[PDB]
Every structure is written in structure tokens, then in C-alpha cells.
Amino acid sequence: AQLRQFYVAAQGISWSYRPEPTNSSLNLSVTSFKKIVYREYEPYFKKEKPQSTISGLLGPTLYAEVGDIIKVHFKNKADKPLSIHPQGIRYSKLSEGASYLDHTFPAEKMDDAVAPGREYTYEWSISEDSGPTHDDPPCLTHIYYSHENLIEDFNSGLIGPLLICKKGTLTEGGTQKTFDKQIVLLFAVFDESKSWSQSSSLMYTVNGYVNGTMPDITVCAHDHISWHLLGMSSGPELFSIHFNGQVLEQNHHKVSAITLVSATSTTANMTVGPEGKWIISSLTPKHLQAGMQAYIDIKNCPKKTRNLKKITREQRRHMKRWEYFIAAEEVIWDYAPVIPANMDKKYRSQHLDNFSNQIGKHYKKVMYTQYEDESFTKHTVNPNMKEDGILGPIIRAQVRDTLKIVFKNMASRPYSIYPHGVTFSPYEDEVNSSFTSGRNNTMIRAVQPGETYTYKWNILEFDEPTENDAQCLTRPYYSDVDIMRDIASGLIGLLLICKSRSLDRRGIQRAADIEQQAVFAVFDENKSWYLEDNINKFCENPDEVKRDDPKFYESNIMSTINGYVPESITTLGFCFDDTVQWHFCSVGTQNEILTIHFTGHSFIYGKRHEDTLTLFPMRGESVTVTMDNVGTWMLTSMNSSPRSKKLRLKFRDVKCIPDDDEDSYEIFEPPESTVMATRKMHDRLEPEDEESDADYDYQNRLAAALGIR
Amino acid sequence: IAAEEISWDYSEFVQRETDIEDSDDIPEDTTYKKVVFRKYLDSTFTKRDPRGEYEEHLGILGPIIRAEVDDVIQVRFKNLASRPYSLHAHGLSYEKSSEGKTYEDDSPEWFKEDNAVQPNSSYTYVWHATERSGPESPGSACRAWAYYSAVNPEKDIHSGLIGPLLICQKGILHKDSNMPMDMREFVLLFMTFDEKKSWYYEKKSRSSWRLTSSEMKKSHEFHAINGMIYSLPGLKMYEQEWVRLHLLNIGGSQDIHVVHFHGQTLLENGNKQHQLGVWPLLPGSFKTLEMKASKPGWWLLNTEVGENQRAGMQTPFLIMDRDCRMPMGLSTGIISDSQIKASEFLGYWEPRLARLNNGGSYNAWSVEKLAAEFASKPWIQVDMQKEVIITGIQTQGAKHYLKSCYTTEFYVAYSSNQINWQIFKGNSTRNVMYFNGNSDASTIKENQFDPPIVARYIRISPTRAYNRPTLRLELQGCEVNGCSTPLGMENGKIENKQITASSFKKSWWGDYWEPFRARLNAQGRVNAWQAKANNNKQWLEIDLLKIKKITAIITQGCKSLSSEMYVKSYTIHYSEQGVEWKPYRLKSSMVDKIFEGNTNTKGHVKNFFNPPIISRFIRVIPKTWNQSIALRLELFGCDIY
Amino acid sequence: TCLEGFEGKNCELFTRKLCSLDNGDCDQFCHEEQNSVVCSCARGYTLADNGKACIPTGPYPCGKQTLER
Amino acid sequence: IVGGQECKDGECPWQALLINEENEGFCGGTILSEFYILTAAHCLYQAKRFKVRVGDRNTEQEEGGEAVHEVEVVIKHNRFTKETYDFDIAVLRLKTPITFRMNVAPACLPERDWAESTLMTQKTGIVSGFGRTHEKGRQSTRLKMLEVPYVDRNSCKLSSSFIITQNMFCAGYDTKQEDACQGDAGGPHVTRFKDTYFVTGIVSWGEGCARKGKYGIYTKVTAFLKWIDRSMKTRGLPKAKSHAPEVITSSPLK
């Protein structure tokens, strides 16, 4: 029943696409266009609000609670009668802000006839059914706009955020009680070419900021912050945003990425950690010709101290001398597998060797592997683990996992390593950070070919996810020196940020099994850094150059899986009692969502049983799937032609009768057979079999939780 | 299931379903050479399934199969054209015996025989129903699937060869032909259809085929919504309905929309802990969730896009009144069935004289003699020359000594253009080829309708009664905007503190009158308000508390069990939050309106008023009169937000 | 009295081929023999006139229920 | 709601009470034939002696000449985990044969085929037992047999801290009321399949029995066919007619 009255007035402001407070670059300004944006005013519309620096072209951020009234007052000052169309429920057609053929009374258009210079108060409210009061965040944002012309009521700056939070733990302004900050985000594409002033200026301006000139979000530590995931684009455009280092908690779930469309009503909150300079990686492959970068400036203001314990609470440590050895070698790896099965003649007899006199056999494709000792020449085996190929192998993290990535480059370009959303030490980098301070807190990831560097950091209990989600979260890692070119060169893998199921030094995955992933990255040779090892240097036909032709272009545009461009060597034929965790990923040069249809097969996610799923780039999607089926079918997609006609899968799933291990070949055992000695599922130990952990000979301290109490 | 090659029209907005503009000439051809499905109750032809009122969402798509646990319906198919057709389902882990996809198999002519159907030859084929589609967790109970051809993954979804597989749970079933309903679920398939990308491509286009149709970019690939364009019918619900909406998208893989309702918050079931508000869509899955309406009116249904709204979907859904059970033409004297049309009558009794319980042995409906009545065509065109919405019609016979005389069965029809008689009302949701009727004579019988039927040329037709065809069908309609609801001026919700009387008549050596019962159908002493004086000075003020939108009015009158008096004219005084006893302004000019009271003795007065009466203290001052002052004042307001 | 080979209300559905699901409407083992299904109980039980359910014969074989009270 | 109703004095034979020579019981058994009694292995190992009596509906009282089924010696099991619980099935080697009476009704032998058709259909079950698995403060004098439903396998490994294999699964209500350690240990969780009765569960204590309203632990003898077959044919024909039929076998159950 609270009165949340606001005074918004739209006007045309010649706002530059770059924050230039100094009049030195105004004579040669590369941006000088008008923008009709929303601007808040005082009662009776006297003086203009100063507005935050983050809200360049964004209007006033409206805030409200449940069961309250919102007598918002608007005064248009542009040129055409605009309106305000929120996302409430109590507002009627007389005050809805939508001008269309309603087939009702003509007097219902009084909310849209707001002439430029006429005041009009909208009598709106909200019902009680707009409050979650559960596992959702205490706020439910909304987007209000003008229903006149969406092509103009957005590119000019006619966008504003509306907040309908929960009455109780919220203050006056949109900030919670236990949280001391309110971070509002906005990522838009102001297409100036399609608006009111038809001027050729197709530029990707995030809130009117180009080349990463967006004002940096800054907040000191020892406090709590709250986010607001908002930002509508011109239409079907998305934004692959990510919060490096600092992990948020969207929908009370510890996540670090969010990529939807049309500004989805979602807010989040988290708790800051140590001081530093983190990154807001706005890595949008389809939106990079203009510029969109941001970072995090975490200082240190000593105000309150939490009970955050560093190590686990007197039961879990597992201090082991296990450092992951990674050497950026240039072993001979090609798009086609070693001796292909389905005969990939398009790459075997054209680019794999000296056939057709194109590239050759000796390549420089660098792959991130994992050795077993300090040799930097052979891993667990001489080749690879087959099940991953050029993709990264199996890496698991736990408390004191000693993630000491002994990286020693030896190719022709300085590389590094960076796991997705991991907090490190002020001494070692392992993250594309610009934090260059003193020698004590310096961090440089530049590892020249020949020099070795170890990124030492102790992953502990403050680096684990929640409890309701899956065990090990999928976080694909990639090089931090380069952004888009190293991914095409085969420098990408996957990391398992698991929960608190640390049993021994390796962490026994309780109620789990093996892992089956699925990657589909479409890249090009021109995107990779080793473009010189194709047609110019590593070449044997200087008279005929395979360029400027569609034949050589599509020969590089390929979708790979486990380092195998045609088809993989393994099948998805599981059996019963397979509590595995399926992972999916599909990075590349795209930005929207990617889907895949499953015929005759389904999965389990969200306490239900869906058929198909939809993954997201940047981050990694994980789901615990139990593969129980008898027969064989296809897993094709429904798109155009280069991604729907050859993206099938041939496998046979059979379980006769339990896990099918009495007359076939599979790495499982029901057992259900003659057991006269020792077989599978025979956990008979002399001291004690199992229970929860192995802190002592019997574990005498009784406090096994799943995080900070 | 069938698949006869019938040319379907994508640009269906020229039919003027809910469109406004008239200068919408089609540059190319309206219809497109495609194939439509059909449902058969038998294995052979010459027997189709009549598309009922509930079977609305289909357009170019054929029927929708409803098979659940312990219930299987055959799907015999026979090719009619010259190309072999296919049929492939999705969802469960069905084997190749009921799959029908063109790939590797095992059986010779059984796993892939359904993909190659020879013309003029039937084939034995039947699908299997599972329990996987049942939504787990306490919340939902339905989750639809999809099925299409399989001879080509792309040339079939554009050839009109689509179909959704709506599968619910088991436990809640209805008596509608043993089909589980007990709700009002909807299903919509949004997917564009292309003529140049299909098997029935006639090598050329209907206008030009140089740079993908020189007239319009992909003119053959129109964004047909639900098989049509600018249509979307059946969106006529009531206030506060938690109906389930099934959103299915299989072909549109590069078209992401976000559904946002104008003033309707969302509520997710299952977990019972989420509110959301908005809910987009992803390609592949079959999203389904409730709606939960709030305020009535023509609320626009859009997806907040620029390419699929003004050129795709733009149909506002209407919410009509729920408690619109007011008298229409029985208790009033203005609205009557004077515009009735028919052909064959039933006897010699009076036509209009068909009131419930009337004096005389002649009270029915007839003009010409009946002679012989059977399964001929005694149609009774009940035309109203306006929009209609009927949810229930009563039926009562006649007697005068002992005989029953009641109609046992009668079929109903309807029409919307007079030139064609769409005799299909008898096959609605529950009905298939029959309809209820009267049972006796002294017991009133009603026939309630389930689907919100809308038309203009209503047609009823009797059959045979108890050796005397006599029918007395009443009239019960409803509102169109959905807000004109009785505030209680005649029921009892509006107390006497709001509607007050003037003077109280009291005799010296006797009793005293109580003229404060100004309601409809009152007993006791008087029946309404009768002041002591008899001039143009008395008043009858009403307190509306808040502002309202009054459109319909009614007025009968009272008496004193001797003489009947009424009022012939009055004036309505409108005001605002404060107090202002000023008559209602005339919108057609600038003066005040001169309202008319009761015309005859007991015949009510029904009139519509487009301009709202935004006021709170409405005053009624009777100008002229008849004998004495008497009127049963009762209006119909709205809830202006 | 419609012709044979066609069953249902107006004799539309054909004869049943395999049992597989729902145990073939018989209270014992369902095992198809290439478009031929036949159910039959082993020892301790007999058969009925058509084969809908095995008629109980023995008083207490290896699996019954006492409905005396 | 069907609560803890006692067993009937008609169709409830599967209750071979395993007591001691004194007035002190320990667990129970399962009646199937005249040469093998399925029960838990901890009934005898790490316990006391063994005294069986079939058709005994009450321990304190006696319903006449009906409880007689003495046992000579007994052995153990190969897969029986001494610390935890896994394949906890033991066979009681009776010494005197008992005919088929009213309170002693035989049952047909299970098979591996009734593993994919009995768990998906019969989602319930009954737990026959005098009440010796949770012998704390609910020792009822009457033979109680309540009804417990079946839950998905993905909710049984977390019911107890011990990781449960495939042999044992859920067989109780949700986390609401007391539905675990019901009846005597080794109690038959027979599920009336179709015209027959096949036992498919043995109640045993894991970490004891306390506040276990989550789920229950019950074995699956359909996979135990290879053990009941190796201990019935390899022992040979009954020498002295159930002596031992036949207790003279190795400890890992042959």
C-alpha cells in the first residue's frame, strides 16, 4: 500500500557514445547524434535528476514492492505522443500505454495522447500474486516501454527498468537489508540506422558506450552486493555475459553466467571476497565490431567480518602433491582422427598429409593435456586418452586440490590457462586480468615458449557450488591471453567444480559414475592463430593459392567432437544403474542459443523427464542423466542443411537383462552371476567399509556440513 | 488419418475474421498447393470426423489425436494423390514398428513401409501410447508432443504435414466420448510455411521466382499463425481462469519469442514457488503453463517482436462476463423475438405467445399447421442481427388438463453469413449428433452449453413431441466487454444506505407504506418506491461508492394489489467524487439527456449507452408519470480501474 | 453380426497380434510367438473356457489369499 | 490411511521366528519350502544361538501345537558385509521336516525374470515381522505387518550414509513417519505379484535403527538365484531327510 510515485519526462539529448567530459575531442568527435531517452524529474517536473554514470541512455530505474500503488506521473517532451507500457496486472486499457486497434471505446487511448509538453499521471498498482517469497530472489524486475514503434522506442533510448520486489527485507530504492549495494545492469544495441533519424550508424553501443568505454563498476570488499540482470536488445540478439572470479547466486544458485534474450526478469546477489581487479567478460562473438568490455574494481573498506573459514571444518583436507602438468606442445593433430573410421576423405586426402599438395602433415595445433610427472613429453600414455582427443581430459577439483598448473609453453606464441570462474592468488595470474600493482600482488600470465610458470592456488571449501544442483559443475577452461582466436586453435577443455564429496585424495564421487560429454565447436583456420601454417608457409603449391574460393572456405568450417570432425570413435550405449553426469557444450562464433533434438531418447533434469535440451556458450551445461533404453535410433537436429543433415549419431543401447554384462562387452557389472569368491559390489573391509569420510581411524569430531554454517 | 491434397490458403486475413482494413489485395495467390489431414472414424473413406467447436486450433493442420493409458485409436491411412506419404511420431522410445523414419532398419516392408504408401491402397498402422508424457510432480497434468512426415526433414514441415500429439495423465477423465478433459486447454503451433521449399513445388511461382519472389521477400514463406494469418479464434474466456496453454515449436529453430500478456501476471505450477511473470520459448521442447486472467477486455496477445507481429500475429483475446445471467427477452418488454424467421410451424397456436405459465390453452409457437412432423426441416432461424453468446437455453412444454406434451429431442444449428447454413452445433464439445430436451410439463428443463458459442444466425429445429409439437425456448445471452455486471441493485449486495427513497407514506388510522424496497421482484406490501406526492420533484438517489461505467438499464414498476402505476420519463443526474446534482450531459451535442421511464405496465425498458457514466452519486428525478410514481430502478455498471 | 477379422463398436479394429504390454489381458506369462500369443498357467492351476484367467483348483498351492474372514 | 495393521491368522505363514534357547528372540525368517529359510546373516553372526519355530504368531503366548521347526547349525554368506549391509541373506538349516499346514504355507521359487516386471508394477508391499529390527520401545506382542510403498532408486543411496548397491533399494514411505526397521530382521517383504507370492526383501539394520523416516532397506532375491541354486543342488539329495539340508557346506555359501 506504499505510494511509489515517480516523475519521468522523456527528452532529446545529444548524448555522445563515449563519456568525454573534456572538451578536447569534441572538434574531432567520432560520435555526435541525438537520443530521445527517459529522464526522471522532481515533482511538478522542475529540475532533471543527475542520473548515475552507468545509465548513459537508460531511463530511471523504477522500484516497487508487492501490494503497493504506483501513481507514476509522465510528461512527454519529445515530438510524438509516447506512452508507458509496463508489465503489471492491475492497470486497465484506459491506462495501459498501448496504442493499437483495441476494438473498444476510443476514450481508452487517453494514456497514449501525451503530447510533447503535456502532463499525464498513470494510476497503476500491483497485486499480491507478484511476490515469490520462496527460493526466488526477493525482487522481480520488469521492463516498461512505449508501444508506439519498437524500432524507435528503443534505439533512441526509450528504455527503463521497473522493479517489483518483496515487502519486508527491502529498503527505499531497491536495496535489500543484508545487502548494502544495488547493481543495475543494461546491455542493449542502439541501432541508429533504424530509428527516427535515419543515419547510417550500425554500431553496437552497450548503453551508449563503444570500445569498452562503459563506466566501470566499483565497490570495496567486506560488504554485500546485489545484482539486477537486465538488458533488452533490438530483438533476437543476446549477450554472453560472465562474472570472472566473483561468483553470483542467481535464483539462490551459485552461478557465474547468464545469457537470455529480451531482458528476462531476473535479479541476483552475492558476497564479495578479497580485493582485486576482476573482469566482466562481455564476450559476444556476433557483437564485437564496435566494442563492449567491462571489469570489476574491488577495493577494501573494513566494515564487517563474516565467519568464513578458509579450510574445511576439521575433517576434510587431502593435502596431496598432485600438480597438473600442462605443456603447450605442437604434436601432429588434424581435423580427421588418427585413421578415420567413416573415411573422412574431405580432410584425409586433402589436408591431412601431402595429398592434393595443399598444407601438409606437420601441423602446429596446440592442445591442453595433462601429464603424470615432470617430463613435458608424455602423459599417462604416449598419444592421447582417445575419449577427449584435442579436448582437455578429465580434471577434478576438491579441497586443497593444489591446482598448480605447471604451464610451460613450447610452440610459437605465448599461451596460458584460465578456468571458468575461479578465484586465484595475488601472486599467480591464470586469468585475463589487468591488475598490475606491486611486486607482492602482481599477476602475469604471459608464458613465453620455453619458459615455465606454475599457477599455485589452493582450491578450498569456498570454491564449491550449492547443494541442490549436480555434484560437479561444468566450467570449460580456455586461454586467457587471447579471447576468440585461441578457442579455434584447440585450446579449450572442461573443469569439474564439484561439491563437498571429498572422500580421499581424489574425491570418491558418491552416487555417481563416469562422464560423457558432447562438444560441437564450429571454427575456421583463419580464426586460429596458426593461419600461416596452411597456405603460405606450410605450402607446396605457390602457383595455385587455395584462397578466394568457396571450396577452401568450407573445408575449414567444420564441427568437431572429441577432436574428431567427422564422427567419434565412442558410442552412447550405456546400461542400467548408470548414474553418470552428461555434459554439453557448443562454443564458436555464434551468440544465440543452440538446441538438439533426440528421437527415441530422453534425459532427466529439473525433477522431470524432458526430451530435448538447450545449452549455452561461454559457461558449461551439466545434467545427471540415467541412460535406460533398448534399441537404436537417430539423434538428428532440425535446422537448415549444414547442421541438420550430417549431425546424426549411430549407436545401439541394449540391456539384457540388467546392465548387459553376461555375454557382451561393457565397463559395468550388475553383477547378477555366479559369485563364489570376489566380484563387483563386494565392499567387505576388515576395519570399516564406508560412511561419510575418513578423517581418522573412526572420525571422532561430528560436524560434516556442506559449506559455511 | 488421411492426407488429401487440398490447396490451403495462408493469407486468410482476407476472410475478414477479426480484421479492420479492407484494402489488402494479395499480389500473388491466396491459396497454396499443400496437403491437409483428416480424421476418419472407420478404415474406409466416405466417413469424416466433423470438426467440432472445440476442434478449432488447426488451420492447415488436420486433427489432434487424444490417446492415453488403456486407450488406443487406430490411424489407418490411404494415399489419394501420386506421391508416397510418411508419418513419424516423437516423444517415447518407440521402436521402428511404430516409428516410420527413413533410415536404417531390420524388417523388410514394415519398419519403412509406412513411409512409402501406394496410391489407392490402405495400410495397417497404429501408434502406441506410453506414460512418459505425463508431467510428474504435483502441478501439471498434460504435456503435448509433435508428429509429422519423414520423407524429408524440411520439405514436409512446410507442406502442411504437421500434427501435435497432446498427451495428458491418467486419473481425471470426462464423459466427452471417454476423452480426458475436465478443463479448457489450448494448443498453438507457430511455424511459417513455404511453398518453394516443399515436395509439391510446381517448378514455378504464382508471380515471380527470380530473386526469391520479386514482389515480397519469401512471399510463399508467410508466417502463417495456426494455419491462417490474422485469425486466432476461440480466445473467448471469462474472468480468472487457470486454463492450460500448450506452446509447441519444432520447425522455428531460429525464431525466439517472449510472450508477454498486457496486464496478466504468471504463476508456475509444479514447484509452487515461482512467479516468473514472463515466459519465452525454446526450439524443440513443448512448453506448457497456465494463464490466470485478471481484468476483462480486448487484451492484445503479442510476443514483443517486430517481424512476427504486424506481419505475423496480432489478435487480442476477449474476456466476457462470468455472472451474466440477467434477463434478456423474457422479463423485459423491449427485447423480443419479433425478428424470428422459419419455414415450417407447429400447429395453430400463437407464435410469440410462449411465456412461462400463461393463461389460456393456446401458448406456444406456430403460424402454419404442422400436419406431419418428422426428420424433415422445421428450422427456426433465431436471428438477432448482432453478436450473440449463449451458455444455456431452457425448455418448457405445455398442458391444460393432464397431457404432458414435451419435445424429446431437437437439433440446433448456426450460421454467420446467412448465405451458408453451418449445421454443426449438434457436434460441439460433449454433443456429437444429439441434444438434450424437455422431460415433462410442470418441471422446467434447461440445456446448458459448455463451449462459448458465438454466431449471429442461430437456428433451432424440433423433431416430434407427445402427439403435439409445442416448444417455448427462452433467451439467455451474455455481455461482450465483460464488465457490465449487476452491482446488486436487485440482488441484495447494495443495501438501503446507498439506494434511498424519498417520502414514506403513512396512513392515520391504519398501516403505513414501506417504499424502500426499490428492487426487482419484491413481495410484502409494495414492490418498489412510491412517493407521497406526484409531480416532477421527487428523487431516487443511488450511492455508487466508486466510479462505474453504466451501459444497460432496466425498470419495471410496482403496484398496490389494485391499480398499476409507473413512470414514463425521468432524468439521470451524474456527478463525481464530490457532489454535483447535474443531469447527464448529451454527448451528441452539449445539452442534457431526456430519459424515458416505464413504457407499459410490467414491460421493462432496455437501452444501451456508449458514453460512460463516471459518477458516484447518481440521482434519478422522475419528470412525467402515470397515475402515481412507481419504478423498479436497476442499472448495470462496471469497475473502471 | 458383423464379419470376422474386424472388431470394435462398428467392427473397425483388427484382431490382436502380440501381447507385450498389459500382459495380454491374461493373468500369466505374456510371450509372443510371431503373431501368435497364448497364455497358460503351469502346475497348481488350470484354464477357463476362453483363457481370460486361470481357474483356481487347488486349495493352497504356492500363492493364494484367504478371504474366509 | 492404512496404518500398522497386524498380520492375519490365515494368509501370513512367512514368519519363522529365530529365537534362542532362553526367553529371548533376535530376528525372524521366511517360509518358502522345507529345506531353506531366507533371513539376514547378522541374525546368527555376531549374535547368539539359533532357535526357529514356524507358524508362531506370538512369542509370549502359544497357539497350541504349531511352533516347531528347530535348527541344528548354520553358516554365513560370501557377499555378506560384516560392517555394513549387502546381500544380507542367510539360509537356516532346519533339523526336522514340517508339512504344509494352515499357518505353514509354501511359496513358489523366484527367478531372474521377475526383476523387470515386479518393481515397475507392484509399487507397494508388506513387511511381515514380529518387530525385532527396532527392538527399542515398540516391541508389540502381536505379529504386525504394515504396508509400505516403493520409491525410485535415485532416492535410496542418500537415505543412509552407507552407499547402497542394486541388491537393496527403497521400500517405504517418504520422509514423513516411521517406515523403517519394521518387523523382525530377515523379515519377508513378499509382494503379491500375480496369482503367486514371491518374496523380494529382507529388512536389516544399517547403523542401527534411529529416526529413519526417510526410506527402508530391503534386498532383492531375484538376483539371489545363483546362490539358492548352488546351495540346493551341490549339497546332493537329503541324506537323513533335512539334517542339515545341508549345513555341511563352506562358509562363503559354496
From Swiss-Prot, chain A:
Site feature (Cleavage) residues: R306, N307, R506, G507, R679, K680
Domain annotation Plastocyanin-like: ranges: 2-165, 175-301, 320-498, 508-656
Domain F5/8 type A: 2-301, 320-656
Residues annotated with Sulfotyrosine modification: Y665, Y696, Y698
Cysteine disulfide partners in this protein: C139-C165, C220-C301, C472-C498, C575-C656
Residues bearing attached sugar chains per UniProt: N23, N27, N211, N269, N354, N432, N440, N526
Modification Phosphothreonine, positions: T612
Positions bound to Ca(2+): D111, D112
UniProt feature coiled coil, ranges: none
Name of the molecule in the record: Coagulation factor V heavy chain
Organism: Homo sapiens (Human)
Gene expressing this chain: F5
Full-sequence range covered: 29 to 737 of 2224
Curated annotation (Swiss-Prot), chain B:
Span covered, complete protein: 1584 to 2224 of 2224
Residues found modified as Sulfotyrosine: Y10
Every F5/8 type C domain range: 324-478, 483-638
Protein name as catalogued: Coagulation factor V light chain
Residues that carry a glycan: N120, N427, N626
Binding positions (Cu cation): H260, H262
Disulfide bond entries: C142-C168, C324-C478, C483-C638
Plastocyanin-like domain location: 1-168, 178-324
Residue ranges occupied by any F5/8 type A domain in the UniProt entry: 1-324
Swiss-Prot record, chain C:
Disulfide bonds: C2-C11, C19-C30, C26-C39, C41-C54
Highest rank taxon of the organism: Eukaryota
Residues of the EGF-like domain: 15-55
The protein's name: Factor X light chain
First-to-last residue of the parent protein present: 111 to 179 of 488
